[PDB]
Amino acid sequence: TCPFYKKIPGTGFTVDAFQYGVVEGCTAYFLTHFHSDHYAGLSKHFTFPVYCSEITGNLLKNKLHVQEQYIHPLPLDTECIVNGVKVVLLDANHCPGAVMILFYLPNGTVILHTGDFRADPSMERSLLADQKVHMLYLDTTYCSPEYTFPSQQEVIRFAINTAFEAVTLNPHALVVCGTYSIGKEKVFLAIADVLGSKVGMSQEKYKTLQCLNIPEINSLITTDMCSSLVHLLPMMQINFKGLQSHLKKCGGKYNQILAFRPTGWTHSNKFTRIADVIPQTKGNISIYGIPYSEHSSYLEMKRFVQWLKPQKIIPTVNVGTWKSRSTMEKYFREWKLEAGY
Ligand SMILES: Oc1c(F)cc(F)cc1-c1cc[nH]n1
Ligand SMILES: Oc1c(F)cc(F)cc1-c1cc[nH]n1
Ligand SMILES: Oc1c(F)cc(F)cc1-c1cc[nH]n1
Ligand code: NI
């Protein structure tokens, strides 16, 4: 059964609620983004209205085969009326097509649902600047002060410089990047661009990237592996055995692999700085774990919430244990007392 934190009270709306069968009284199902834990349950047999971004709608149509008649794409930054209720979609700074949703309830209450997001000061000059938000449904993935990591720009600078140095020293080196979902496309696109290469990948991954429908990505991707010196593989293959196996298939074209595993936060962030990061190495294979996050750091989250000044916060991540729930509630109270309430 559908949990309380996925229902929007005083409406017929749910958010990211496709794995619970027919939800009683739900007239419209919102989907914040195309990640599997959020879309779980959608297929060609779904017959209720789905509201989402254009990019999310492209993925629903082509990857999950949802019928066109049930897909309702909405433009960003635009007041829209859905089943008698004013809504706005805002960029979430997560993966491609990811949104936050502002709901203007009939009773005068205003709700912001962040979906998954990476909070940024630029959100302080969105349509959020205008008015009061009563309730915030918050992506609390990294809601603890130990969760630190660098900016996306700093991580990409490291990856570009590392890859360019390696291939300039050894023109016969291959670069490999791991993936298991949409998001983090900058890692492989930025490396390919500096090396003057397209990114080679499976037909299935090519299809997914096409669905994003953006010319710059299309110009840098191919299914012809032999023509490319940056290859994408499933994240599960980014290990010494998997990479050894892959190098055999390349027909003596390469004699070294440099590989990148984009992760989220890992405990090595507590000790090491991005500039001091070193790889795991075995013979002619090296693997770098790089902390490229598409979720807010603790400090980014705190800044956003202290700016927004919501009356109530409902966490949507780490909700399963009493320890997690208690810890998050203590941070929200600290932030409030500091902020002057
Ligand atoms: O995600 C992107 C990326 F990684 C590289 C790029 F050039 C463009 C995008 C993008 C996202 C939405 N519109 N365009
Ligand atoms: O955390 C808050 C903050 F930083 C500023 C603010 F105005 C309110 C809160 C809050 C916490 C729980 N309910 N409201
Ligand atoms: O363990 C707990 C529990 F069972 C119930 C509860 F409300 C809180 C906790 C907890 C643990 C650490 N901090 N808070
Ligand atoms: Ni996500």
Swiss-Prot record:
What induces or represses expression of this protein, per its UniProt record? During mitosis. The mRNA encoding this protein contains an internal ribosome entry site (IRES) in its 5'-UTR. This 5'-UTR generally suppresses translation while specifically promoting expression during mitosis, when cap-dependent translation may be impaired.
Compartment annotation: Nucleus
Q: In which tissues is it expressed?
A: Expressed in brain, heart, kidney, liver, pancreas, placenta and skeletal muscle.
| Annotated TM spans | none
Q: What does the annotation say about its assembly with partners?
A: Binds constitutively to TP53BP1. Binds CDC27, which is itself a component of the anaphase promoting complex (APC). Binds PIAS1.
Family named by the database record: Belongs to the DNA repair metallo-beta-lactamase (DRMBL) family.
User: What role is this protein assigned?
Assistant: May be required for DNA interstrand cross-link repair. Also required for checkpoint mediated cell cycle arrest in early prophase in response to mitotic spindle poisons. Possesses beta-lactamase activity, catalyzing the hydrolysis of penicillin G and nitrocefin. Exhibits no activity towards other beta-lactam antibiotic classes including cephalosporins (cefotaxime) and carbapenems (imipenem).
Protein name (Swiss-Prot/TrEMBL): DNA cross-link repair 1A protein
Write down the species: Homo sapiens (Human)
The encoding gene is DCLRE1A
**Whole-protein coverage range:** 700 to 1040 of 1040
